[PDB]
Amino acid sequence: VGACVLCNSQTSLRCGACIRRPFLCCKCCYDHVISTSHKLVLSVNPYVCNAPGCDVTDVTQLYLGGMSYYCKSHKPPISFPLCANGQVFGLYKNTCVGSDNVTDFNAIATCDWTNAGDYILANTCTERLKLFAAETLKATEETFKLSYGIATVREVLSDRELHLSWEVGKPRPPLNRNYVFTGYRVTKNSKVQIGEYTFEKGAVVYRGTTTYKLNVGDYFVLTSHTVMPLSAPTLVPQEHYVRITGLYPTLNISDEFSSNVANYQKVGMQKYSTLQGPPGTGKSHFAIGLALYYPSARIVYTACSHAAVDALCEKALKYLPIDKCSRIIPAVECFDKFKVNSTLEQYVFCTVNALPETTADIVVFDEISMATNYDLSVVNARLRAKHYVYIGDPAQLPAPRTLLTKGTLEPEYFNSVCRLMKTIGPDMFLGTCRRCPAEIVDTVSALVYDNKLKAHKDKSAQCFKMFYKGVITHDVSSAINRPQIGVVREFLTRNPAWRKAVFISPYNSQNAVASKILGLPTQTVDSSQGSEYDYVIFTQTTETAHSCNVNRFNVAITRAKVGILCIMSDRDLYDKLQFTSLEIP
């Protein structure tokens, strides 16, 4: 028994064809089965024919006769159909309201999550459907990992390098950081975990969560997890106040956090507030600063990734009493300078999926662009706070949507919080980039920030751009542009100072060929997000939607403190780079 995700109407029915089995009310259960292919219906039992070896599961073809369910064939003389009168049969028949359109819920219930339009719906539908979609999508995402073949150690060629044999008649996952495996040694009568792993083409290069002497017959699967049902909305109902509420501002603040005193005040006069922090504009400085501005306030610092939480801890370590901090870790190596799993400590740093059930004066959810509505709901479910602050940049990179291949996902669809920042705009904006040369600040300001991002640093005159398509080759799940690397090889012979540069591209295979040929450290744009380097060499590699995504490109070029070379494929983004043009060697 439970609550009809469309009416809320109290019902005894769940759709059995829906992978989440949402409770549906007589009206809504009915309007769902007749308009889709979903016809299995679960109650306190499954509406299936209890006749001996009868296949009939379709609720339209079934009847209650006695207190058992039957098809046309096996039914007793006295029966009524389970599914007529615009209603399916269960408890609470008399309480039931329905809807004018069940269209959105049917599409969420039945979409395969490969098209952008699916994520657009999950973000514009009603809030209760946002939760149902967020569950349905995540469960689809975890199930699709099982579709992938087991990889098995056939040969140990060296250290860091392996020969994999692959389960037959199942697809192989792409071999980039987005796919994290789990090893396993072959035991008496079962299997035991042996760390999480990632892989890259060679054989295969593996970078594992621990070190081992892993031997032949050890095998790797993408560990999937149970997706829980969602209760809390993605955003709580907004409230605006006329005084700061529940928080006591400091009398003396340092001139280091003085630029955020206005903003910290806004944080205190609404229930939840959005901070768009462009690259190197001071998000974590803002987040720790809030503690100093509201010294007595209990603050839970949260984010999706261990790395985002650890970065909030590193900043905290520099400004807040250590004895007042605790890192929550569930029973991967993360920040170990705070007492571990002390829920009652004044400053709690902890990832979304490890959050305890607790209250707080402020919740700071950092790197908000990487959040899904699933994560938004979890936070609201685990943490009851006087104030919620969502820090991020909807111009940076979202969580990867492993399933999505048709359409592009616009930032107003990354999650509820981002949707607000792109539609009404953010409550607050860090408007001065400290990290990057003026030429890169001026470019992204125009590109994705509506000419509101200001350069702290001057021009470096060390920002170059070259229009060179070269030659694209494809391997199994990536791209390579050898001529674009060749051009960098030549630039480096003529500009050897640039040998301190990080190499960035939108493809891990481009990156692998580059590491061999240039010996620069390499990053994918997606793995570079939240890191800074003096000198960046970027090869676009392709002109695909992937390699021209304005958010990817925004993150690529804003990694540079001093200088950047961009070897560009796309004439559009080339022309938007406010950089010195260099001609083809």
Ligand X SMILES: NC(=O)c1cnc(C(F)(F)F)nc1
Binding-site members for a ribonucleoside 5'-triphosphate are 277-284
Of the pair 396, 484, the CB lying nearest ligand X is at: 484
Query: Pick from Zn ion, ligand X, none: which does 557 bind, CB < 5 to 8 A by kind?
Result: none
For 251-277, give one letter per residue: b (16+ CB within 10 A) or e.
Answer: eebeeebeebeebbebbbbbbbbbbbb
Of the pair 303, 488, the CB lying nearest ligand X is at: 488
Query: Pick from ligand X, Zn ion, none: which does 491 bind, CB < 5 to 8 A by kind?
Result: ligand X
Residue 497 found at the interface with ligand X (CB under 6 A): no
Distant-in-sequence, close-in-space partners of 384: CB < 8 Å, separation ≥ 6:
359, 360
Of the pair 95, 581, the CB lying nearest ligand X is at: 581
Of 216, 207, 197, the closest CA to residue 157 belongs to 216
Of the pair 28, 453, the CB lying nearest Zn ion is at: 28
Q: What's the min distance (Å) between Cβ of 494 and ligand X?
A: 5
Q: What's the min distance (Å) between Cβ of 560 and ligand X?
A: 17
Number of residues counted as binding ligand X (CB under 6 A): 7
Element (H, E) at 580: strand 580-581
Residue with tokens 């111009």: 395
Count Cβ atoms within 10 A of the Cβ of residue 59 and give its class: 0-12 exposed, 13-18 middle, 19 or more buried.
Answer: buried
Residue 583 found at the interface with ligand X (CB under 6 A): yes
The answer to whether 555 and 536 have CB atoms below 8 angstroms apart is no
Residue 517 found at the interface with ligand X (CB under 6 A): no
Q: What's the min distance (Å) between Cβ of 463 and ligand X?
A: 13
Of 301, 311, 306, the closest CA to residue 345 belongs to 301
Distant-in-sequence, close-in-space partners of 244: CB < 8 Å, separation ≥ 6:
265, 268, 269
Element (H, E) at 104: helix 103-110
Near Zn ion by CB under 5 A: residue from 41, 109, 480, 567: 109
Given the rule CB under 6 A, which of 40-48, 272-280, 423-431, 577-585 is the region that contacts ligand X?
Answer: 577-585
Q: Specify binding-site residues for Zn(2+).
A: 4, 7, 15, 18, 25, 28, 32, 38, 49, 54, 71, 74
Residue 97 and residue 75: Cα distance in Å, rounded? Answer: 30
Near Zn ion by CB under 5 A: residue from 56, 108, 362, 420: 56
Residue 14 found at the interface with Zn ion (CB under 5 A): no
Q: How many angstroms separate the Cα of 16 from the Cα of each of 57, 152, 472?
A: 10, 35, 47
Q: What's the min distance (Å) between Cβ of 131 and Zn ion?
A: 15
Element (H, E) at 192: strand 191-201
Of the pair 57, 182, the CB lying nearest Zn ion is at: 57
Given the rule CB under 6 A, which of 16-24, 37-45, 75-83, 483-491 is the region that contacts ligand X?
Answer: 483-491
Binding track over 27-46 against Zn ion, x by CB under 5 A: -x---------x--------
Residue 336 found at the interface with ligand X (CB under 6 A): no
Query: Helix, strand or coil for residue 356?
Result: coil
Near ligand X by CB under 6 A: residue from 160, 494, 496, 516: 494
Of the pair 88, 520, the CB lying nearest ligand X is at: 520
Query: Pick from ligand X, Zn ion, none: which does 490 bind, CB < 5 to 8 A by kind?
Result: ligand X
- For 355, the token pair is 């959050």
Of 291, 333, 338, the closest CA to residue 313 belongs to 338
Residue with tokens 């004066």: 361
Residue 382 found at the interface with Zn ion (CB under 5 A): no
Q: How many angstroms separate the Cα of 226 from the Cα of each of 50, 140, 270?
A: 30, 11, 35
Residue 225 found at the interface with ligand X (CB under 6 A): no
Residue 361 and residue 270: Cα distance in Å, rounded? Answer: 12
Name the amino acid, one letter, at 561.
K
Query: Pick from ligand X, Zn ion, none: which does 559 bind, CB < 5 to 8 A by kind?
Result: none
Residue 18 found at the interface with Zn ion (CB under 5 A): yes
Residue 3 found at the interface with Zn ion (CB under 5 A): no
Binding site for ligand X (CB under 6 A): 487, 490-491, 494, 582-583, 585
Binding site for Zn ion (CB under 5 A): 4, 6-7, 9, 15, 17-18, 25, 28, 38, 49, 51, 54, 56, 71, 73-74, 109
